[PDB]
Enzyme design. Sequence first.
Site, PDB file in Angstrom:
ATOM      1  N   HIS A  91       2.284   0.406  -9.859  1.00 19.73           N
ATOM      2  CA  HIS A  91       0.929   0.534  -9.329  1.00 19.73           C
ATOM      3  C   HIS A  91       0.938   1.390  -8.071  1.00 19.73           C
ATOM      4  O   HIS A  91       0.271   2.421  -7.990  1.00 19.73           O
ATOM      5  CB  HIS A  91       0.351  -0.850  -9.014  1.00 19.73           C
ATOM      6  CG  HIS A  91      -1.044  -0.818  -8.477  1.00 19.73           C
ATOM      7  ND1 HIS A  91      -2.148  -0.837  -9.294  1.00 19.73           N
ATOM      8  CD2 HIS A  91      -1.512  -0.629  -7.219  1.00 19.73           C
ATOM      9  CE1 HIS A  91      -3.240  -0.745  -8.555  1.00 19.73           C
ATOM     10  NE2 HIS A  91      -2.882  -0.605  -7.292  1.00 19.73           N
ATOM     11  N   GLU A  92       1.723   0.989  -7.082  1.00 18.96           N
ATOM     12  CA  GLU A  92       1.671   1.669  -5.799  1.00 18.96           C
ATOM     13  C   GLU A  92       2.122   3.118  -5.914  1.00 18.96           C
ATOM     14  O   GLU A  92       1.582   3.990  -5.225  1.00 18.96           O
ATOM     15  CB  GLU A  92       2.508   0.912  -4.775  1.00 18.96           C
ATOM     16  CG  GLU A  92       1.905  -0.410  -4.384  1.00 18.96           C
ATOM     17  CD  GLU A  92       0.532  -0.248  -3.754  1.00 18.96           C
ATOM     18  OE1 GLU A  92       0.345   0.764  -3.038  1.00 18.96           O
ATOM     19  OE2 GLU A  92      -0.351  -1.127  -3.959  1.00 18.96           O
ATOM     20  N   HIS A 114      -0.623   5.492  -6.806  1.00 21.02           N
ATOM     21  CA  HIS A 114      -1.338   5.980  -5.633  1.00 21.02           C
ATOM     22  C   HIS A 114      -0.560   7.101  -4.949  1.00 21.02           C
ATOM     23  O   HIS A 114      -1.153   8.054  -4.423  1.00 21.02           O
ATOM     24  CB  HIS A 114      -1.582   4.840  -4.634  1.00 21.02           C
ATOM     25  CG  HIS A 114      -2.459   3.726  -5.138  1.00 21.02           C
ATOM     26  ND1 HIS A 114      -3.783   3.903  -5.458  1.00 21.02           N
ATOM     27  CD2 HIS A 114      -2.218   2.400  -5.283  1.00 21.02           C
ATOM     28  CE1 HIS A 114      -4.304   2.749  -5.831  1.00 21.02           C
ATOM     29  NE2 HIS A 114      -3.376   1.819  -5.733  1.00 21.02           N
ATOM     30  N   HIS A 145       4.595   1.035   1.136  1.00 22.27           N
ATOM     31  CA  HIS A 145       4.959  -0.094   1.978  1.00 22.27           C
ATOM     32  C   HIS A 145       4.702  -1.409   1.264  1.00 22.27           C
ATOM     33  O   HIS A 145       3.632  -1.607   0.688  1.00 22.27           O
ATOM     34  CB  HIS A 145       4.180  -0.092   3.276  1.00 22.27           C
ATOM     35  CG  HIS A 145       4.466   1.080   4.146  1.00 22.27           C
ATOM     36  ND1 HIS A 145       3.682   1.407   5.230  1.00 22.27           N
ATOM     37  CD2 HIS A 145       5.431   2.019   4.075  1.00 22.27           C
ATOM     38  CE1 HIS A 145       4.174   2.480   5.814  1.00 22.27           C
ATOM     39  NE2 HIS A 145       5.228   2.877   5.125  1.00 22.27           N
ATOM     40  N   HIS A 197      -7.843   3.744  -8.071  1.00 22.45           N
ATOM     41  CA  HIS A 197      -7.897   2.515  -8.850  1.00 22.45           C
ATOM     42  C   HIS A 197      -8.775   2.683 -10.080  1.00 22.45           C
ATOM     43  O   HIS A 197      -9.698   3.500 -10.108  1.00 22.45           O
ATOM     44  CB  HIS A 197      -8.372   1.346  -7.979  1.00 22.45           C
ATOM     45  CG  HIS A 197      -7.308   0.780  -7.083  1.00 22.45           C
ATOM     46  ND1 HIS A 197      -7.575   0.270  -5.831  1.00 22.45           N
ATOM     47  CD2 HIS A 197      -5.985   0.566  -7.297  1.00 22.45           C
ATOM     48  CE1 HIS A 197      -6.451  -0.171  -5.289  1.00 22.45           C
ATOM     49  NE2 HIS A 197      -5.474  -0.010  -6.161  1.00 22.45           N
ATOM     50  N   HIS A 242       0.847  -1.186   0.000  1.00 22.30           N
ATOM     51  CA  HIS A 242       0.000   0.000   0.000  1.00 22.30           C
ATOM     52  C   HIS A 242       0.884   1.238   0.000  1.00 22.30           C
ATOM     53  O   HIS A 242       2.055   1.190   0.383  1.00 22.30           O
ATOM     54  CB  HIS A 242      -0.975   0.038   1.184  1.00 22.30           C
ATOM     55  CG  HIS A 242      -0.324  -0.138   2.520  1.00 22.30           C
ATOM     56  ND1 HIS A 242      -0.370  -1.323   3.218  1.00 22.30           N
ATOM     57  CD2 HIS A 242       0.391   0.717   3.282  1.00 22.30           C
ATOM     58  CE1 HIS A 242       0.281  -1.185   4.359  1.00 22.30           C
ATOM     59  NE2 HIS A 242       0.756   0.043   4.420  1.00 22.30           N
TER      60      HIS A 242
HETATM   61  N1  LIG Z   1      -6.543  -1.345  -0.916  1.00 22.78           N
HETATM   62  C1  LIG Z   1      -6.540  -2.751  -1.445  1.00 22.78           C
HETATM   63  C2  LIG Z   1      -5.140  -3.379  -1.428  1.00 22.78           C
HETATM   64  N2  LIG Z   1      -5.184  -4.778  -1.901  1.00 22.78           N
HETATM   65  S1  LIG Z   1      -3.691  -5.386  -2.122  1.00 22.78           S
HETATM   66  O1  LIG Z   1      -2.783  -4.922  -1.121  1.00 22.78           O
HETATM   67  O2  LIG Z   1      -3.762  -6.789  -1.949  1.00 22.78           O
HETATM   68  C3  LIG Z   1      -3.144  -5.117  -3.614  1.00 22.78           C
HETATM   69  C4  LIG Z   1      -3.830  -5.643  -4.696  1.00 22.78           C
HETATM   70  C5  LIG Z   1      -3.389  -5.425  -5.996  1.00 22.78           C
HETATM   71  C6  LIG Z   1      -2.263  -4.672  -6.267  1.00 22.78           C
HETATM   72  C7  LIG Z   1      -1.837  -4.499  -7.696  1.00 22.78           C
HETATM   73  C8  LIG Z   1      -2.779  -4.616  -8.713  1.00 22.78           C
HETATM   74  C9  LIG Z   1      -2.403  -4.474 -10.050  1.00 22.78           C
HETATM   75  C10 LIG Z   1      -1.083  -4.230 -10.421  1.00 22.78           C
HETATM   76  C11 LIG Z   1      -0.679  -4.087 -11.891  1.00 22.78           C
HETATM   77  S2  LIG Z   1      -1.171  -5.429 -12.980  1.00 22.78           S
HETATM   78  C12 LIG Z   1      -0.549  -5.266 -14.572  1.00 22.78           C
HETATM   79  N3  LIG Z   1      -0.762  -4.116 -15.281  1.00 22.78           N
HETATM   80  C13 LIG Z   1      -0.252  -3.983 -16.528  1.00 22.78           C
HETATM   81  C14 LIG Z   1       0.512  -5.054 -17.125  1.00 22.78           C
HETATM   82  C15 LIG Z   1       0.710  -6.276 -16.330  1.00 22.78           C
HETATM   83  O3  LIG Z   1       1.362  -7.245 -16.783  1.00 22.78           O
HETATM   84  N4  LIG Z   1       0.160  -6.299 -15.099  1.00 22.78           N
HETATM   85  C16 LIG Z   1       0.983  -4.721 -18.506  1.00 22.78           C
HETATM   86  C17 LIG Z   1       0.542  -3.254 -18.652  1.00 22.78           C
HETATM   87  C18 LIG Z   1      -0.352  -2.821 -17.477  1.00 22.78           C
HETATM   88  C19 LIG Z   1      -0.139  -4.111  -9.404  1.00 22.78           C
HETATM   89  C20 LIG Z   1      -0.508  -4.245  -8.057  1.00 22.78           C
HETATM   90  C21 LIG Z   1      -1.559  -4.148  -5.192  1.00 22.78           C
HETATM   91  C22 LIG Z   1      -2.002  -4.366  -3.882  1.00 22.78           C
HETATM   92 ZN   LIG Z   2       2.017   0.521   5.916  1.00 19.49          ZN
HETATM   93 ZN   LIG Z   3      -3.711  -0.321  -5.222  1.00 19.90          ZN
END
Ligand SMILES: NCCNS(=O)(=O)c1ccc(-c2ccc(CSc3nc4c(c(=O)[nH]3)CCC4)cc2)cc1
Ligand SMILES: [Zn+2]
Ligand SMILES: [Zn+2]
Length: 161
Positions: A114-115, A118, A92, A124, A79
């Site tokens: 991703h993080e 944020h 983190h 999201h 997160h």
């Molecule tokens: N507040 C809820 C938190 N839930 S978590 O901690 O379990 C969580 C869940 C998902 C993610 C997360 C989701 C998606 C991604 C990116 S996925 C992805 N995107 C792309 C490609 C790929 O291969 N994978 C190619 C281009 C865009 C990264 C982290 C991070 C934390």
């Molecule tokens: Zn934390």
């Molecule tokens: Zn997220």
Amino acid sequence: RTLKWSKMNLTYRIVNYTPDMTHSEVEKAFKKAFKVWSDVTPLNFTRLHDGIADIMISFGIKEHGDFYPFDGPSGLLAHAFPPGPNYGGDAHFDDDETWTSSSKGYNLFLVAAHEFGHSLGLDHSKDPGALMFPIYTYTGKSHFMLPDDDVQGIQSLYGPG
Ligand SMILES: NCCNS(=O)(=O)c1ccc(-c2ccc(CSc3nc4c(c(=O)[nH]3)CCC4)cc2)cc1
Ligand SMILES: [Zn+2]
Ligand SMILES: [Zn+2]
Ligand SMILES: [Ca+2]
Ligand SMILES: [Ca+2]
């Protein structure tokens, strides 16, 4: 008005490293992660070896010093906080996970990109093909190109470079 950084020059520090990867593999992975956003915005990111930086990155487990504790293996994985002072912007990563630069486990680069979204003020996405979609997947693309839904979103905050 939306929530965002007022400056375009941000600093990050890698506080501690995961045992799952070498110092260099971690540093390379985070740097490529910030580049994702720097390439499409006026943002610039420089790494500090000491002291307080805007985005402070650390690995940790269970109760680690904020109201959002991790849960050990599986479950939650990382997160990051939206822009602001102190905890604002920080990221983190749950170190009971398995962080990799490959197909195995969670790919640290992808999750950091991703993080860090944020950290800059993005929420999201509803597009399953976005980087900011709440479900992790690993596509094994030959090279990574930041999908259009997210370049639109981050540019709405900072504009093109
Ligand atoms: N507040 C809820 C938190 N839930 S978590 O901690 O379990 C969580 C869940 C998902 C993610 C997360 C989701 C998606 C991604 C990116 S996925 C992805 N995107 C792309 C490609 C790929 O291969 N994978 C190619 C281009 C865009 C990264 C982290 C991070 C934390
Ligand atoms: Zn934390
Ligand atoms: Zn997220
Ligand atoms: Ca976990
Ligand atoms: Ca901070």
